[PDB]
């Protein structure tokens with residue numbers, strides 16, 4: 001006999017529809033969602049490998065790379081960060097991290113745990129790092145790797161990347177980039193920009209379900225991994241082993257770990273959607289949507305965390321809480337009345353701003369208009385003395 | 389302008405239905421599959437936490453534990469092994485691993501990478517370790533942890549666990565058990581058996597989609613983690629942080645990483661299914677199915693890798709390839725003609741046996757009978773000189 005089953009599992013599962021307009025996760029399309037519904041395949045099934053290959057092709061397209069070592073880590077976007085750090089750094093290696101958001105702080109935490117010698121350079125959360133600042137810091141610290149956040153979803157800040165790789169390469173340094181919140185939202189060119197290691201998030205701009213993380217490393221980064229003195233700490237995302245199963249190398253595929261079939265089907269479909277519309281058009285649609293958002297916020301008298309428009313990530317915008325305002329009072333009204341997701345702050349924006357994402361299925365003019373409408377109605381009903 | 393999209397993404401996604409009767413992944417039910425279809429929820433949405441709690445309850449039920457630190461790692465089963473090892477071991481700590489299958493070999497590899505002092509004890513792949521052998525090894529090596537595979541999917545071997553925890557505890561040793569292939573297939577009692585750390589697989593007996601790993605640690609194992617000298621190497625599965633977000637502790641939940649909502653909804657529904665039928669009944673159904681399998685294989689003149697029925701894991705059976713026989717020709721015929729998954733060998737059974745799973749939605753008498761039929765017809769059509 002067994003201690004009895006829980007009563008909480010007697011009710012049916014009910015998950016409401018929501019208008020997911022925070023900085024992640026985004027709304028997935030019906031097509032992407034129903035893809036998860038296919039048969040879970042065995043590790044060496046031909047149709048799994050074929051889907052995996054289509055994903056790598058899709059990934060090379062969105063990263064704009066020809067990297068053969070393009071694959072996925074079986075984890076959320078944190079695991080992509082974890083993988084770059086555990087594979088590219090040995091104990092004692094110097095890593096330079098430019099820190100002006102929460103993701104870089106996570107990267108510091110991870111590099112420490114992996115026993116790297118962590119060199120940081122601080123900056124304001126609302127202004128990027130200059131080529132000069134970075135060049136200087138690289139010269140000084142002579143790091144094996146530089147980590148940069150491309151689009152920062154804790155602030156709404158976009159980091160220019162042109163020229164950075166070149167400098168890194170001048171100094172025997174790998175450039176690793178976190179493109180989780182930026183990819184498919186603004187131009188990105190892994191190869192043109194000399195980037196050695198990049199990852200995105202499924203559940204951000206792509207509108208894919210979370211849990212699997214697209215990744216790409218350059219032949220240079222790859223050769224650095226092949227030549228390490230010691231095994232990397234984590235078998236699960238050892239990129240030699242994982243790349244082998246993904247068919248990235250001139251080697252027969254060996255069982256490594258069971259991949260999330262269903263998440264792969266969905267990622268594939270999300271990649272097809274962007275391939276069908278085209279990168280340029282998606283980026284342009286998201287840029288327009290940002291503009292409509294900025295205008296509408298202006299008319300309400302609301303300020304934007306990243307003040308200079310030149311510096312703004314289109315896909316995530318911090319809306320500053322005005323003085324008298326309870327942010328959570330607005331957000332809950334939004335959800336209860338409009339099923340609208342009005343997300344709060346994180347890191348730099350914690351307690352200071354709400355965060356609006358333009359990602360996945362809400363990257364339309366109509367969606368942005370509805371957001372502005374529901375946000376306004378929500379602030380209005382909730383703080384009747386606010387003046388627009 | 390962008391280098392053009394891949395043509396491979398222009399075709400619709402087409403995944404065939406298959407009768408998934410290898411040792412993983414299993415067929416998920418329609419209910420479980422369509423649950424993935426729900427809205428991807430934000431990390432602090434109430435309905436996510438509610439579903440997470442139901443999962444914990446379902447987990448305590450199938451593990452038969454009252455552990456508060458019952459939760460999921462965001463990875464496939466390997467990540468659960470990774471988590472146990474990185475959390476419970478510090479650099480230099482002695483871990484004892486009893487090695488007679490591939491999973492223990494993986495645990496050796498991981499423990500090495502995490503800088504443990506790995507002690508091993510070998511055994512035949514087709515016979516379990518005795519209490520005497522294990523007690524002796526524990527006494528000798530004085531390990532911080534003992535790792536055991538419960539059900540071995542590479543062999544079809546079932547390891548008796550009664551008495552092992554007691555011995556470990558007499559010696560200040562933690563018992564960590566891999567129940568990936570055994571859970572819900574045979575009786576298991578985490579608490580009664582004095583086990584401190586356990587994980588299963590979603591895509592094995594449970595009939596849930598792969599990519600998320602149920603886990604439970606004892607208050608003892610928990611206190612060990614709270615008292616470590618150094619941070620664990622992997623932030624992503626740091627169990628103090630992950631258990632916090634899962635609400636395992638007397639602490640307010642902090643953002644750790646984005647969990648796979650869709651995989652959680654599915655797991656929840658797989659847990660509800662087994663809760664509705666009950667553990668005892670599911671275990672008895674799988675035990676009968678194995679008997680039917682054994683009988684049918686006997687009639688065909690076919691040998692079973694684990695010879696003594698006393699030692700067999702009901703959910704995975706190794707079918708020895710007869711002398712003249714091309715295992716893969718049989719398997720492909722089975723798929724092409726019956727959509728039947730006849731899996732090959734792994735580790736101990738590599739090139740020696742096929743592997744039949746009794747897991748997920750194929751744990752029925754009718755499914756076993758069809759397997760026997762399809763298998764036989766496939767051997768027959770493919771090797772006309774084989775004698776039954």
Ligand SMILES: *Cc1c(COP(=O)(O)O)cnc(C)c1O
Pocket residue numbers: 257258412464465466467491537539540541542566567568569589592598
């Ligand atoms: C299949 C299996 C694993 C592997 O899990 P993945 O989901 O493939 O990472 C680990 N342990 C046992 C006992 C298994 O059967």
Ligand SMILES: *Cc1c(COP(=O)(O)O)cnc(C)c1O
Pocket residue numbers: 024076077078079103149151152153154178179180181182201204210645646
């Ligand atoms: C949201 C985000 C992450 C976190 O990813 P998870 O999928 O939550 O693990 C990492 N980097 C950036 C830039 C992000 O926006």
